[PDB]
Automatic annotation (TrEMBL), chain A:
<dbReference type="Pfam" id="PF05721">
    <property type="entry name" value="PhyH"/>
</dbReference>
<dbReference type="GO" id="GO:0046872">
    <property type="term" value="F:metal ion binding"/>
</dbReference>
<protein>
    <recommendedName>
        <fullName>Phytanoyl-CoA dioxygenase</fullName>
    </recommendedName>
</protein>
<dbReference type="InterPro" id="IPR008775">
    <property type="entry name" value="Phytyl_CoA_dOase-like"/>
</dbReference>
<dbReference type="GO" id="GO:0016491">
    <property type="term" value="F:oxidoreductase activity"/>
</dbReference>
TrEMBL record, chain B:
<dbReference type="GO" id="GO:0000963">
    <property type="term" value="P:mitochondrial RNA processing"/>
</dbReference>
<dbReference type="Pfam" id="PF26188">
    <property type="entry name" value="RESC6"/>
</dbReference>
<dbReference type="GO" id="GO:0003723">
    <property type="term" value="F:RNA binding"/>
</dbReference>
<dbReference type="GO" id="GO:0044528">
    <property type="term" value="P:regulation of mitochondrial mRNA stability"/>
</dbReference>
<dbReference type="GO" id="GO:0006396">
    <property type="term" value="P:RNA processing"/>
</dbReference>
Automatic annotation (TrEMBL), chain C:
<dbReference type="GO" id="GO:0003723">
    <property type="term" value="F:RNA binding"/>
</dbReference>
<dbReference type="GO" id="GO:0090615">
    <property type="term" value="P:mitochondrial mRNA processing"/>
</dbReference>
<dbReference type="GO" id="GO:0005739">
    <property type="term" value="C:mitochondrion"/>
</dbReference>
<dbReference type="GO" id="GO:0005737">
    <property type="term" value="C:cytoplasm"/>
</dbReference>
<feature type="domain" description="RNA-editing substrate-binding complex 5 protein">
    <location>
        <begin position="1"/>
        <end position="288"/>
    </location>
</feature>
From TrEMBL, chain D:
<dbReference type="GO" id="GO:0048255">
    <property type="term" value="P:mRNA stabilization"/>
</dbReference>
<dbReference type="Pfam" id="PF26172">
    <property type="entry name" value="RESC8"/>
</dbReference>
<dbReference type="GO" id="GO:0016554">
    <property type="term" value="P:cytidine to uridine editing"/>
</dbReference>
<dbReference type="GO" id="GO:0003723">
    <property type="term" value="F:RNA binding"/>
</dbReference>
<dbReference type="GO" id="GO:0031019">
    <property type="term" value="C:mitochondrial mRNA editing complex"/>
</dbReference>
Length: 314, 452, 297, 516
RNA sequence: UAAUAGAAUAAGAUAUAAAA
RNA sequence: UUUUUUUAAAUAAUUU
């Protein structure tokens, strides 16, 4: 068609249509024969497959990049001048136009620069592909958590695979990146070692969420969903809280128990999750897996513009 | 790039924009400019109004939205220092804020509109054209400012202070705003006539297009434009041929001596026709009403080899034009239906309805396009007129679609506009077809309104 | 140097000028277009500003508002142009828009019975020369002399009074200096009298005197740049030959209709000299007007 | 290396777990800027936390410059920081001191706001009497720095300042004079009276007072020349010992005032060039320009000034290459070494020069003989072809004329220049001649281009002289124009200035006479 | 405890409508 | 071929 002379350089209405990656954070993606620099050591892979989690030895982002990403997260929750492309989001805590002490966002890779770029970050996608047995890895979705200062709540015990029951096979991983320095007094991730292999790769019953209650009970509700043997393994290996720097990344199994603490510092705390999924993955029902997305039928392979292939071992 | 101050960054950003919007769209220059502008900040340094305006303009042109920092800092500066934005950097700020749609952008645009309204009497040749084009980019309805600017343009053009490019810019700017003033366009036409040989074909075609678009209904100047264009046919490009086809269909007057030569030149360059040119030509022929099968066969044949090049707009226009004239091309229709099924998410509010109705009017039903368009109708139901809603409902009834998740939005839209729905006589027959399929069970209130 | 002009108002152009002579409005518009184009084609004028039309024809006389003497922009008394005050405010808005002075000097207006007009003063070399006619009184002479006349070995400014008769037009219309040493005067009684008085007041003065034909309006931008562009009327060819013979550049201009209404070339343009304020020790760049690298080639 | 207590305090500050007031962050930043033993500037996770502590604190406690210093020390590390804007006092918070502090905050931290200026001025007027003499001068200075257009209030302040002439000192008088001269719309009566007051107390002045007075007189203009007279007489007894910057200001004022008593000019220039070696780059440039404008560059003058400027010639600012390049022209003195070094420096910075500066440099080097055999011609040709989109009519004419005079041959560049010049019409003959000169180098152009060129040149033939007529005819014959209206117009002018044809007449003219 | 300034410059199609 | 203007304007009506 004919694009007006002052609209030639614009981007699509949503960044999903943009094939490839923009050069915003780390420039252009490396060449085909340049992807071996970002490989990770086998011991990290063994640690993940043993504990159900591991920390990447090197921070994945420079401090300027973390500053830019924190600015994007701040602008995603303006609440006075709402973010453009807000209608391109799977779910938002500002749908009520009031917000609260916890701001959670999903599918923001179609909304802002940099967040879309972070998906194709080589250092994390190569590691996730190595965890997923060297196959094509497709983004499942992102997530952003922002907790206010002195009142931020905590999300209790949960399993990631409990939210993805519409997807047939167990082939996933999660990468969590800290956009601000975190510790047990501000949203630290607390995980149980060796919990991804408890119920023969099964899902534990959901926990009871009662808001407006102290963090101690919220984190102690764990003794309600487990059995005696899981209790003994808990006693041997109590849940461990992990400290993260301003750029450090953490790989988590989909099936390991996971929680985050409250925020009792004097500033808001930010973190970002991205879930990565393997090639051989099918659907179970007929329809869209996420709101306003391409619909699948029976056991159809999951592809499309909504689940782009981020890395290819060929 | 670190040793460059903000002033040099602004100059190089302007250079990159000028190189990209004119000499090709090299996907390298755009991405380099995006990367450079993503890491700049107007903070802690004293900057002129022009440099800040240039940075804001070149940032917004390259996709940067109203959530970016650079944009926020430039907008805050433009809000705080208002008297520093003289009449030289007003067009840059207005053009940058045209596409941004927020509170601050609206306030800045209004303030600049009032400033240009007050100083409308002291502008010169460059400023009037630049300001009027910049205000035509944004959608604003400040009639008094337009009147003052038109008066100043007439006063300047009486003495002869406009060139061919200025005339084209002024004509397009005043036609885009739907400001119908006979004296201003007469003055512009007379200035071009005085210019004589200084207007070439490239500076003549947009003049005719804009003069047709404004719709003055003056048959005195249309004939003169046709006679002037008759000598320049042999030098025209294919895009120019399509542009004059559309323009002289917009005029509405029949000039056979011109249409014949235009048809011959269009046939000569049939190998240079893209899908856009074919769609434009067929739409122009549909509008003017002439029926010329000889050119139509060649247009249809050339459209068959560029199927993959078709956009949503081109598919819609081509299919509607082909269906109006009763031309049958089963291969072209099938390929267009498949392609429309592939890109069903690119149809706008009215293109979808036009495509569906054009496909349903002729006896051509294909499930691939039918399912895609029926599913896509949900997101464009809310932007439809009463007649367009009636056409969409009839086309959907012809496709035999019964999914309630599709039919609830269109029935809601047609119930909200029932008066204009049932007061259009030309569609009355269509109404009796629609309820012949769904029956009184489907949406009883609509049936009760129909019986009355 | 910025030159200001005003477009004619076609609808309200007078049918028959004073004296009952006839005028053609289309030709008047055409001649003003030719004048504007000729002014723009001048190399010395940095910009030509065109003000919006005003209902009265007298608004075409924009030169009557004020006068430029050295670095002083003196505003003429508003004693006979009461209906033209609003036009003067509108002209001052135009002057301010182009980066000129914020406001005019009001020295003459405060003085009582100080009748004067822009046009009886000639920016001669080494001072100004004023004419003592009916349109200006002796109070204006005394006030100008007290304001601008200074006698010094070097800081010298000379004001000259030149007596003229009642029927004589304003001095700038017929007696004026051009080039650097050339005095252009109408081969008329008043022109010869003014030339003689200027020669006498300032004795031992050497400058060629050129006599044009009567009725040949002229305009010369007199300044250090030594521009030789001298606009003259089209009809008179002998004045044109005389100006060319002195080493100048006559630029013919059709000036029939404006002449028929009583307006001359000098009364139709407002020339001003602006500068840019230089904060801190500063020396703004200036455009060149000569040749470069003379010694090499 | 951080020991246990040091590491724990670092961690506590990193986690935003400590409440910091503005004073404490200021003290820590001062310690970091003074001493670097603990590596405060080398820990991004620590200065980021300090910045987060600074944002959420009350910055109104500290002085404006302390906030500016914290912002600067965070900017130096790599954190984008800006101190918060101060709110206008309301209700009983009204006082002269707070109304001065608002302007001071807007001044130091570089946050100019016209709305807040207008609000503050609308609220300080009633209490103008209560103000102390020093606060009046402070307000005048602050309003002069903020480029406020409200000249009426500045005039009122200046009048109240004059009413206390006895109280003020020489420094305050000079500051008031310069701050009044900087305001554009100030009435000339108050300016005359202030210069009258400056005229007395003349012997009390110090070098700073002299600099302030000379700056004010340079800003004002020739209309106050008389006052400047008493300045040059006053300094005639101290000229043998003055600061170099003072003599540079004297030269600038001499050039601006168009002074005509030449003996003072000669004495002051002779005193200046003795100590000209102490001048900075900018002051050296302006001494050179002012001396050139006064027609005082003799042989020794130019030799000494060139020897002084060749030191900075290695790293000249781009804005200073063109002026000295112009000064090297129009003088009959040898300046080969300065020319060569300046051309090399110009070549070095060819990717940062703006369009106007590139055009000016090409114009100045257009007729230079040694500038043809250099890489600068090709580099500048490519740069000009790239920058043709950003060039106005003056820049286009300058660059094209300079390139044509230099022998640069590139048909595509000249065709693009002709198109860009056809975008906006040529107002003058001097703006159109370079296009013809460039297009005549190759000798061919598309017929539409030559037709448009003929249409443009035809009206302009009415006022050009004989030499311009000959040059235009030569260029048109080289390009090959067939249009008759042109030749007819050129013919008529020729006749008017030359009557009828004669055997003596030049052949070309006689041909031009035939209207070919 | 903290205060110094320079530049003048123009790109161009959104699928509508009754009388010297 | 040419045709245009320069107020602080404040009185509609409703249960939306």
């Amino acid at each position: 068609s004919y694009v007006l002379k002052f609209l030639r350089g614009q981007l699509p209405e949503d960044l999903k249509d943009v094939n490839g990656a923009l050069g915003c954070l780390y420039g252009t993606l490396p060449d085909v024969d340049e992807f071996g620099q970002f490989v990770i050591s086998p011991d990290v892979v063994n640690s993940f497959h043993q504990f159900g989690y591991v920390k990447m030895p090197i921070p994945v982002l420079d401090h300027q990049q973390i500053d830019k990403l924190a600015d994007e997260v701040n602008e995603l929750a303006n609440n006075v001048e709402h973010h453009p492309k807000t209608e391109r989001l799977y779910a938002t805590s500002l749908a009520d136009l009031t917000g609260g002490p916890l701001f959670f966002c999903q599918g923001q890779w179609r909304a802002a620069w940099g967040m879309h770029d972070l998906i194709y970050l080589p250092t994390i996608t190569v590691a996730a592909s190595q965890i997923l047995n060297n196959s094509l890895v497709r983004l499942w979705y992102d997530e952003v958590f922002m907790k206010a200062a002195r009142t931020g709540p905590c999300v209790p015990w949960q399993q990631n695979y409990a939210r993805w029951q519409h997807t047939k096979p167990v082939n996933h991983v999660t990468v969590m990146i800290a956009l601000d320095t975190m510790n047990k007094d501000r949203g630290a991730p607390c995980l149980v070692p060796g919990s991804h292999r408890w119920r023969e790769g099964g899902l534990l019953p959901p926990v009871s969420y009662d808001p407006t209650k102290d963090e101690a009970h919220q984190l102690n509700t764990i003794w309600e969903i487990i059995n005696e043997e899981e209790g003994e393994m808990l006693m041997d290996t109590p849940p461990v809280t992990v400290d993260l720097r301003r750029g450090e990344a953490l790989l988590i199994h989909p099936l390991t128990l996971f929680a985050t603490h409250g925020n009792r510092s004097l500033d808001a705390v930010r973190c970002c999750f991205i879930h990565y999924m393997g090639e051989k993955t099918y659907a179970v029902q007929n329809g869209p897996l996420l709101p306003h997305t391409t619909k699948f039928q029976a056991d159809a392979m999951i592809q499309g513009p909504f689940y782009p292939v981020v890395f290819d071992p060929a | 790039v670190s040793h460059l101050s903000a002033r040099n960054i602004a100059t190089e950003a302007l250079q990159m924009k000028k190189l990209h919007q004119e000499r090709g769209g090299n996907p390298m220059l755009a991405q380099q400019a995006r990367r450079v502008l993503f890491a700049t900040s107007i903070a802690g340094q004293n900057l002129d109004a022009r440099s800040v305006a240039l940075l804001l303009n070149t940032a917004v042109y390259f996709g940067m939205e109203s959530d970016a920092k650079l944009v926020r800092e430039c907008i805050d500066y433009c809000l705080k220092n208002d008297k520093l934005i003289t009449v030289d950097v007003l067009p840059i700020v207005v053009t940058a804020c045209a596409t941004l749609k927020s509170r601050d952008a609206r306030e800045v645009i209004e303030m600049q509109a009032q400033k240009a309204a007050r100083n409308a009497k002291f502008l010169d040749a460059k400023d009037v054209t630049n300001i009027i084009s910049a205000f035509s980019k944004t959608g604003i309805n400040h009639e008094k400012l337009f009147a003052f600017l038109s008066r100043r343009v007439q006063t300047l053009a009486r003495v002869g202070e406009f060139e061919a490019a200025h005339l084209v810019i002024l004509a397009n700017a005043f036609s885009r705003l739907r400001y119908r003033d006979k004296f201003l366009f007469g003055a512009i036409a007379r200035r071009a006539m005085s210019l004589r040989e200084r207007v070439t074909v490239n500076e003549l075609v947009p003049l005719i297009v804009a003069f047709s678009k404004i719709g003055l209904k003056d048959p005195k100047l249309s004939k003169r434009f046709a006679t002037k264009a008759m000598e320049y046919v042999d030098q025209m490009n294919a895009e120019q041929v399509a542009s004059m086809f559309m323009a002289f269909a917009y005029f509405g007057i029949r000039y056979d001596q011109l249409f014949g030569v235009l048809t011959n030149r269009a046939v000569e360059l049939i190998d240079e026709f893209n899908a856009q040119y074919i769609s434009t030509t067929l739409n122009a022929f549909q509008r003017i009403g002439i029926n010329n099968p000889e050119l139509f066969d060649n247009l249809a044949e050339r459209a068959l080899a560029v199927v993959q090049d078709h956009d949503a707009r081109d598919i819609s226009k081509t299919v509607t034009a082909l269906a109006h004239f009763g031309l049958k091309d089963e291969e072209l229709f099938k390929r267009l239906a498949s392609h429309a099924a592939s890109i069903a998410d690119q149809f706008d509010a009215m293109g979808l309805v036009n495509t569906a109705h054009a496909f349903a009017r002729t006896n051509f039903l294909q499930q691939d396009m039918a399912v895609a368009l029926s599913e896509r109708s949900v997101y464009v139901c809310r932007l439809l007129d009463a007649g367009e809603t009636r056409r969409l409902l009839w086309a959907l009834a012809k496709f035999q679609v019964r999914d309630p998740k599709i039919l609830t939005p269109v029935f809601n839209r047609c119930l909200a506009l029932h008066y204009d729905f049932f007061a259009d006589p030309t569609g009355s027959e269509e109404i009796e077809e629609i309820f012949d399929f769904y029956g009184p069970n489907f949406c009883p209130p609509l049936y009760q309104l129909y019986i009355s | 140097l910025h030159a200001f002009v005003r477009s004619p108002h076609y609808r309200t152009i007078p049918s028959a000028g004073p004296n009952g002579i006839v005028v053609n409005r289309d030709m008047l518009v055409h001649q003003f277009r030719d004048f504007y184009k000729t002014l723009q084609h001048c190399s010395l004028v940095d910009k030509v500003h065109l003000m919006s039309e005003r209902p009265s024809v007298e608004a075409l006389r924009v030169a009557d508002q004020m006068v430029s003497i050295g670095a002083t922009f003196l505003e003429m008394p508003l004693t006979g142009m009461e209906h033209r005050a609003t036009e003067f405010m509108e002209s001052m808005r135009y002057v301010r828009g182009a980066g000129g002075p914020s406001t005019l000097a009001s020295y003459l207006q405060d003085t009582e019975n100080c009748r004067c007009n822009s046009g009886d003063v000639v920016c001669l070399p080494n001072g100004i020369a004023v004419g003592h006619g009916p349109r200006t009184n002796a109070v204006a002479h005394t006030t100008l002399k007290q304001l601008f006349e200074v006698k010094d070995d070097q800081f010298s400014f000379d004001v000259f009074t030149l007596e003229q008769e009642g029927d004589a037009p304003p001095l700038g219309d017929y007696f004026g200096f051009a080039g650097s040493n050339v005095l252009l005067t109408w081969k008329d009684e008043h022109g010869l009298l003014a030339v003689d008085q200027y020669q006498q007041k300032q004795p031992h003065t050497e400058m060629n005197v050129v006599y044009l034909e009567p009725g040949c309006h002229f305009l010369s931008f007199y300044g250090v740049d030594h521009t030789i562009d001298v606009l003259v009327q089209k009809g008179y060819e002998r004045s044109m030959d005389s100006i060319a013979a002195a080493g100048l550049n006559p630029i013919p201009v059709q000036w029939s209709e404006m002449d028929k209404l009583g307006i001359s070339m000098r009364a139709a343009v407002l020339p001003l000299k602006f500068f840019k304020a230089n904060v801190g020790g500063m020396l703004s760049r200036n455009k060149s007007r000569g040749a470069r690298w003379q010694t090499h080639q | 290396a951080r020991p246990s207590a040091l590491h724990l305090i670092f961690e506590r500050c990193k986690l935003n777990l400590v409440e910091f007031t503005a004073q404490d962050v200021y003290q820590i930043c001062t310690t970091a800027y003074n001493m670097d033993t603990l590596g405060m500037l080398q820990d991004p996770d620590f200065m980021r936390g300090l910045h987060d502590a600074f944002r959420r604190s009350d910055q109104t406690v500290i002085s404006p410059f302390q906030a500016n210093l914290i912002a600067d020390t965070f900017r130096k590390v790599g954190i984008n920081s800006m101190p918060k804007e101060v709110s206008v006092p309301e209700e009983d918070a009204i006082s002269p001191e707070s109304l001065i502090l608002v302007l001071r905050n807007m001044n130091i931290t570089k946050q100019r706001d016209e709305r807040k200026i207008n609000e503050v001025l609308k609220l300080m007027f009633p209490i103008l009497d209560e103000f102390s003499p020093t606060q009046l001068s402070l307000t005048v200075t602050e309003l002069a720095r903020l480029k406020s257009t409200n000249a009426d209030f500045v005039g009122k302040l200046a009048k109240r300042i004059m009413e206390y002439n006895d109280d003020l000192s020489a420094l305050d008088i000079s500051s008031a004079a310069v701050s009044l001269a900087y305001c554009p719309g100030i009435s000339h009566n108050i300016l005359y009276r202030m210069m009258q007051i400056v005229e007395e107390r003349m012997g009390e002045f110090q070098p700073e007072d002299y600099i302030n007075v000379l700056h004010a007189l340079n800003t004002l203009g020739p209309k106050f020349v008389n006052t400047f007279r008493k300045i040059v007489e006053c300094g005639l007894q101290h000229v043998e010992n003055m600061d170099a910057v003072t003599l540079t200001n004297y030269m600038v004022c001499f050039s601006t005032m168009d002074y005509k008593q030449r003996e003072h000019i000669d004495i002051y220039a002779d005193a200046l060039v003795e100590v000209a070696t102490d001048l900075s780059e900018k002051d050296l440039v302006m001494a050179f320009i002012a001396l050139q404008r006064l027609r005082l560059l003799s042989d020794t003058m130019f030799g000494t000034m060139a020897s002084c400027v060749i030191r900075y010639a290695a790293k000249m600012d781009p804005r200073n290459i063109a002026p000295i390049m112009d000064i090297c022209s129009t003088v009959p003195h040898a300046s080969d070494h300065l020319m060569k070094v300046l051309m090399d420096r110009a070549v070095e910075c060819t990717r940062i020069l703006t369009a106007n500066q590139l055009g000016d440099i090409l114009d100045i080097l257009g007729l230079y003989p040694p500038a043809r055999e250099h890489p600068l011609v090709q580099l500048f040709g490519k740069q000009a072809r790239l920058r043709l989109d950003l060039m106005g009519p003056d820049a286009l004419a300058n660059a094209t004329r300079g390139l044509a005079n230099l022998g640069y041959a590139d048909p595509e560049y000249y065709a693009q220049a002709a198109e860009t010049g056809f975008r906006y019409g040529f107002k003058d003959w001097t703006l159109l001649e370079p296009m013809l000169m460039g297009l005549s180098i190759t000798g061919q152009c598309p017929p539409t281009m030559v037709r448009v060129l003929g249409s443009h040149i035809a009206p302009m033939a009415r006022s050009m002289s004989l030499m311009e007529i000959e040059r235009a005819n030569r260029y048109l014959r080289r390009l090959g124009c067939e249009d008759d209206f042109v030749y007819k117009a050129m013919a008529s002018r020729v006749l008017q200035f030359v009557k009828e044809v004669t055997p003596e007449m030049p052949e070309d003219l006689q041909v031009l006479l035939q209207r070919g």
